[PDB]
Amino acid sequence: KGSFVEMVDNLRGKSGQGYYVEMTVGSPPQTLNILVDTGSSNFAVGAAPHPFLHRYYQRQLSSTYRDLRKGVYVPYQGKWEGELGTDLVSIPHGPNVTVRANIAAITESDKFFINGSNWEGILGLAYAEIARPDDSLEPFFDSLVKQTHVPNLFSLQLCGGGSMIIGGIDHSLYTGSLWYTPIRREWYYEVIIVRVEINGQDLKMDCKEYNYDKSIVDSGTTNLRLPKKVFEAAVKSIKAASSTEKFPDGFWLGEQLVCWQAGTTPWNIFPVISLYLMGEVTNQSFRITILPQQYLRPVEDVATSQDDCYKFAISQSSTGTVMGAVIMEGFYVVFDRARKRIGFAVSACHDEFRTAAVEGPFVTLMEDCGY
Ligand SMILES: NC1=N[C@@](c2cccc(-c3cncnc3)c2)(c2ccnc(C(F)F)c2)c2cccc(F)c21
Ligand code: NA
């Protein structure tokens, strides 16, 4: 155990409900399913009964628990609040190690836990800068790296199951080349989008529009979220490409499903979306190409099962671009913290006409694209 091979397929999930890894907290170990979240920096676990919780962290049963005598209140679409402490943590299908880490024991929450998601807490994988109550609460990955010989890198293969490879890159999880984009600032995993194309047609905006006010890679968000101006242009362009069929406005707003008779989804009418990411060299970029099989999220429901029903998984944001799970799915994503960069490669996990791609280089002879 502890080898990248034994880490393959260590993630599970429910579509739109996040991807989770099995973890243990306390001594003796208490097994919990934990949402893998690149969009936050707290390790926070249900620590009191809840209607949506199968199990929860019982601090009174752990001799290794240490109370930090400090509250944490996290309002955000909902909220969670609790108490801080430290305890022994391990990932049974991860590295062969046990570490002492900060843990926020969630004692009260609103719209945080989801009915039937199968997870009991969240593993915030981003940086200390966005940790709550402040940057002095060391995130889990920082403790893991400080306490062991685990390399300062992790990778995610999200399969729309999947794999979280801690401390390395597993070559069996992707094909082709790994293309790197710089982490602009170590808070969220912030990146820069330099160009957006839909059906190979450039949106023709100043590239700063794509990164208003930041662009991040977030496994804890389902959708591709875009700033208002970008979102409006994307929708207009997708509507034009798919004009042979007209859908309700609620569909485009992500509040209404679109259904087709089972096996008849007209994938061909929907365009490919290309996001060009800043390269590791000046004015060089690479693109990641997403198919409608990624941006039209199937909604599993026995009641609608004579059909295949989808939610449009692209939505408006007022807090910048969010490259959520629907974007990460079908790409092997390397969070290369040691080299302050994020790598993308086509994942080993489309149709007979098109395939998702990671390709480059592209030259734009260009202004700075960030805020
Ligand atoms: N990326 C994020 N992680 C948060 C979160 C909280 C609860 C459930 C999910 C989730 C639901 N469905 C599918 N995937 C994920 C995500 C989050 C917000 C605040 N505090 C934390 C904390 F635990 F670190 C996490 C969250 C809330 C809102 C916007 C976001 F970008 C995130
Ligand atoms: Na180390």
UniProtKB/Swiss-Prot annotation:
Post-translational modification N6-acetyllysine, affected residues: K70, K204, K208, K214, K228, K229, K236
Catalysed reactions, semicolon-separated: Broad endopeptidase specificity. Cleaves Glu-Val-Asn-Leu-|-Asp-Ala-Glu-Phe in the Swedish variant of Alzheimer's amyloid precursor protein
Active site, UniProt feature: D37, D218
Entire protein: shown range: 57 to 445 of 501
GO cellular component term, pick one: Golgi-associated vesicle lumen
Superkingdom of origin organism: Eukaryota
Family listed: Belongs to the peptidase A1 family.
UniProt keywords, alphabetically: Acetylation, Aspartyl protease, Cell membrane, Cell projection, Cytoplasmic vesicle, Disulfide bond, Endoplasmic reticulum, Endosome, Glycoprotein, Golgi apparatus, Hydrolase, Isopeptide bond, Lipoprotein, Lysosome, Membrane, Palmitate, Phosphoprotein, Protease, Signal, Transmembrane, Transmembrane helix, Ubl conjugation, Zymogen
Assembly: Monomer. Interacts with RTN1; RTN2; RTN3 and RTN4; the interaction leads to inhibition of amyloid precursor protein processing. Interacts with SNX6. Interacts with PCSK9. Interacts with NAT8 and NAT8B. Interacts with BIN1. Interacts (via extracellular domain) with ADAM10 (via extracellular domain). Interacts with SORL1; this interaction may affect binding with APP and hence reduce APP cleavage. Interacts with NRDC AND NRG1.
EC primary class: hydrolase
Listed name of the protein: Beta-secretase 1
Residues covered by the Peptidase A1 domain: 19-345
GO biological process terms, semicolon-separated: amyloid fibril formation; amyloid precursor protein catabolic process; amyloid-beta formation; amyloid-beta metabolic process; cellular response to amyloid-beta; cellular response to copper ion; cellular response to manganese ion; detection of mechanical stimulus involved in sensory perception of pain
EC number assigned by the record: 3.4.23.46
Membrane topology: Single-pass type I membrane protein
